[PDB]
Design a protein around this ligand. Structure first.
Ligand SMILES: [Mg+2]
Ligand SMILES: [Mg+2]
Ligand SMILES: [Mg+2]
Ligand SMILES: [Mg+2]
Ligand SMILES: [Mg+2]
Ligand SMILES: [Mg+2]
Ligand SMILES: [Mg+2]
Ligand SMILES: [Mg+2]
Ligand SMILES: [Mg+2]
Ligand SMILES: [Mg+2]
Ligand SMILES: [Mg+2]
Ligand SMILES: [Mg+2]
Ligand SMILES: [Mg+2]
Ligand SMILES: [Mg+2]
Ligand SMILES: [Mg+2]
Ligand SMILES: [Mg+2]
Ligand SMILES: [Mg+2]
Ligand SMILES: [Mg+2]
Ligand SMILES: [Mg+2]
Ligand SMILES: [Mg+2]
Ligand SMILES: [Mg+2]
Ligand SMILES: [Mg+2]
Ligand SMILES: [Mg+2]
Lengths: 48, 58, 119, 210, 102
RNA sequence: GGGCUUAAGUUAUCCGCCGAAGCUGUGGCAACCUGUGUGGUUGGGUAGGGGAGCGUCGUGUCAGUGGUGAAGCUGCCGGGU
């Protein structure tokens, strides 16, 4: 007699997706990349 | 043993890390905070190290 | 699931335009310009809620100084006399006494005069 | 717990008896497990035919709108750039499948727990059949209302020629009809009671039993 | 007849029948509290010393809990992206002065 | 800056006071530690790391609700860190 509205996930099983670049109260603006440089825009290869 | 009475009269800002750690070891945490320590040479040494930041009594 | 921004977006704009409802020029009409002034308004209000203590203490001290100098006693000697006499009536109640009950303030002045070190 | 219990076959009034095997119809109801299985079920049910055109797929926009310098305008590379009205969508939806590869043991157990919860709550009835001879919806509406309430599940399993019961209960709109080889956790949880046909219960037990 | 009294590190000039905005106290509404007096003035008669102020009792009763104005803090610093929103209400307690008995 | 040597200048010394978001008093909030009756410590903050949430749209389920007026828009009176 659970009924579909009593089904909930275990606590901690569904971590909230972090949404980046959505205001300075979170990972806003630079989006966790800092300022300028290669890493500001793409990446650096692991073999480099 | 005369139970030294030490109170902080100046802030630890801009003091040397030596002095700040000496204050922490003495247990003083704010300006006006008072601690009681034994008349032991180590505590006399801490007091003379931070003598410009604290006052001592008996 | 395409989402249109307007219904959610207007809420902060209405809040800020309400908060800026006495400002001059663009500061009360335009959300972006009102937003800049609300930052300054909040900073000024926070700073002034803490400077208000000092402002009112200064006003009380000036009024006490005037009232005690009317009795031939400076503010510093008056306060030292009260401290020595052990009367812990504060700058605020003392100023209210000076404005309202000048006779009670003068009695306190006599108390301070008697409690002076006389040295 | 693995207790096998006994329910009584009805056919309206009374008939023989049927056994609930216990190893299924009496197990734990792992709510998180059931939730995951049901969510995966609905995700598989999703169709996901949604798409947008990127700046490369929007018509036109091949040439630079104007010179890079000298015009006093911002540097633009295409009229279909995402910041333009009528330009491409940057990270809009693309067609995809939402099916999740839930393990067999997880899916089956969730089904066992969902069945077991209302087996312990006494919401499974077993009937020899509904309707006799030719097939109406009035008859079974009665058989089920005599059973209890109207948020129902029916099992008739007989996938090829149980047209009588299937077509009788097909049009109730508060009855969900299934073959025993398609019980699935979503429907079991959604059901407030299950009524098995005798053959339906027998075939489900035969398909899965220890 | 009035009294300079103290309550919760803040002083008031109270008189019998006055309503005073006191810092929140645990005593329940309708009960009575004693406000410590620091001065008494009965008209050209000023009681100020501790020994006599010990004998005088300012008695008052609790009326209810009232909230202050809603304060909106927005800490902000330019060119850093820093903001911090906060609010405050600062509940107090009504008091009615019932008597200053010497 | 006004003005100041009739110091409101320099200097020695004594007695007071002013003075910060420092300290203390009072009221509220929060993080952490600790034996878990207490209490202790802490809470400026950019890049950045961690944690917990608000609001919008779609949707399963249950409970609903709506021309005796939904959505949206717009006043007033309130509420929350
Ligand atoms: Mg930032
Ligand atoms: Mg920005
Ligand atoms: Mg980073
Ligand atoms: Mg950058
Ligand atoms: Mg940049
Ligand atoms: Mg750089
Ligand atoms: Mg970098
Ligand atoms: Mg790296
Ligand atoms: Mg590569
Ligand atoms: Mg002056
Ligand atoms: Mg192209
Ligand atoms: Mg231009
Ligand atoms: Mg190009
Ligand atoms: Mg298009
Ligand atoms: Mg800077
Ligand atoms: Mg202060
Ligand atoms: Mg402080
Ligand atoms: Mg304090
Ligand atoms: Mg912080
Ligand atoms: Mg701090
Ligand atoms: Mg940061
Ligand atoms: Mg209706
Ligand atoms: Mg809508």
């Amino acid at each position: 007699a659970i009924e579909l509205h009593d089904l909930k996930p275990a606590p901690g099983a569904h971590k909230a997706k972090t949404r980046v670049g959505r205001g300075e109260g979170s990972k806003g603006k630079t989006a966790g990349r800092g300022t300028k440089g290669t890493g500001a825009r793409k990446n650096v290869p692991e073999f480099f | 043993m005369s139970k030294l009475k030490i109170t902080q009269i100046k802030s630890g800002i801009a003091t040397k890390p030596n002095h700040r750690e000496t204050l922490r070891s003495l247990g003083l945490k704010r300006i006006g905070d008072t601690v009681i320590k034994e008349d032991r040479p180590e505590f006399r040494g801490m007091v003379r190290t931070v003598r410009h930041l604290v006052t001592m009594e008996e | 699931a395409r989402v249109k921004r307007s219904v959610n977006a207007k809420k902060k704009r209405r809040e800020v335009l309400d908060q800026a409802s006495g400002y001059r020029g663009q500061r009360s009409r335009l959300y972006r310009k009102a937003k800049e002034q609300t930052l300054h308004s909040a900073t000024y209000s926070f700073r002034d809620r803490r400077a208000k203590k000092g402002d009112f203490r200064s006003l009380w001290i000036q009024r006490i100084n005037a009232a005690s100098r009317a009795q031939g006693m400076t503010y510093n000697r008056f306060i030292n006399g009260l401290k020595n006499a052990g009367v812990e009536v504060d700058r605020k109640m003392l100023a209210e006494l000076a404005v309202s009950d000048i006779n009670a303030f003068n009695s306190l002045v006599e108390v301070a005069k008697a409690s002076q070190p006389q040295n | 717990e693995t207790k096998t219990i006994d329910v009584l076959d009805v056919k309206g009034k009374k008939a023989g008896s049927a056994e609930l095997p216990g190893d299924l119809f009496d197990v734990n109801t792992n709510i998180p497990l059931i939730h995951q299985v049901v969510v995966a079920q609905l995700a598989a049910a999703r169709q996901g035919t949604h798409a947008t055109k990127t700046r490369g797929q929007v018509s036109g926009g091949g040439k630079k709108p104007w010179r890079q310098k000298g015009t006093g305008r911002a540097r633009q590379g295409s009229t279909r750039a995402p910041q333009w009205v009528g330009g491409g969508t940057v990270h809009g939806p693309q067609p995809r499948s939402y099916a999740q590869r839930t393990p067999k043991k997880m899916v089956g157990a969730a089904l066992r727990g969902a069945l077991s919860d209302m087996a312990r709550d006494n919401r499974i009835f077993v009937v020899t059949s509904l309707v006799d001879g030719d097939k109406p919806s009035t008859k079974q509406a009665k058989a089920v209302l005599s059973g209890l309430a109207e948020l129902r599940k029916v099992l008739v399993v007989l996938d090829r020629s149980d047209e009588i019961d299937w077509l009788s209960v097909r049009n109730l709109s508060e009855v969900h009809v299934l073959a025993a080889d398609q019980l699935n956790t979503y429907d079991v949880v959604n059901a407030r009671t299950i009524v098995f046909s005798q053959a339906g219960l027998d075939a489900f037990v035969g398909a899965r039993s220890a | 007849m009035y009294a300079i009294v103290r309550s919760g590190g803040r002083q008031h000039k109270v008189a019998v029948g006055d309503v005073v905005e006191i810092d929140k106290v645990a005593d329940e509404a309708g009960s009575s509290i004693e406000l410590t007096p620091l001065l008494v003035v009965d008209g050209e008669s000023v009681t100020s010393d501790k020994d006599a102020l010990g004998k005088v009792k300012v008695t008052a009763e609790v009326l209810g809990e009232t909230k202050g104005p809603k304060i909106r803090i927005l800490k902000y610093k330019n060119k850093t992206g820093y903001k911090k929103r906060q609010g405050h209400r600062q509940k107090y307690t009504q008091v009615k002065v019932t008597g200053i008995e010497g």
